[PDB]
Design a protein around this ligand. Structure first.
Ligand code: A1BQ7
Ligand code: ZN
Length: 140
């Protein structure tokens, strides 16, 4: 589990969104595994605006932050799970790291700020849903 709290937005994995998220919806994209809902309180996370390919992510199944090298956001084949059928997920970045069921939502961050959230795992891989192109997270 986990979210990005930027301005009056909450950024979560679409597959983990709550009823309150759906009742306060700003934007959702199944192809990216992302959903954004509105918040009453202002958050403290800042979004990175960059093409960093190194950073650090939080792994809840280890209680550890790991430094990683990750691929540029791409259209990556993702295997069928309890949340989605076999499909191409867009804006996904891959790294080598521990990610098991429950690690989705952990933040990936670089020197500039938050890059994305854990969205895939297994096989000693971890995938991150990129948020750096969502410029609207910074206003309104
Ligand atoms: N965005 C998606 O389509 C996700 C949905 C959750 C599952 N998933 C994984 O890649 C995954 C996550 C955690 N541990 C794992 N072990 N084996 C596979 C996995 C795909
Ligand atoms: Zn950066």
């Amino acid at each position: 589990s986990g979210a990005i709290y930027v301005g009056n937005y909450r950024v979560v994995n679409r597959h983990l969104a709550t009823h309150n998220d759906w009742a306060n919806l700003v934007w959702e994209d199944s192809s990216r595994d992302l959903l954004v809902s509105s918040t009453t309180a202002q958050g403290c996370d800042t979004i990175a605006r960059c093409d960093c390919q190194t950073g650090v992510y939080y792994c809840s199944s280890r209680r550890k932050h790991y430094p990683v090298s990750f691929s540029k956001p791409s259209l990556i084949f993702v295997e069928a799970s309890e949340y989605y059928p076999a499909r191409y997920q867009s804006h996904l970045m891959l790294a080598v790291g521990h990610s098991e069921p429950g690690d989705c939502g952990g933040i990936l961050r670089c020197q500039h700020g938050v890059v994305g959230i854990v969205s895939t795992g297994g096989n000693g891989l971890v995938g991150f849903a990129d948020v750096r192109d969502l410029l609207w997270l910074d206003e309104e």
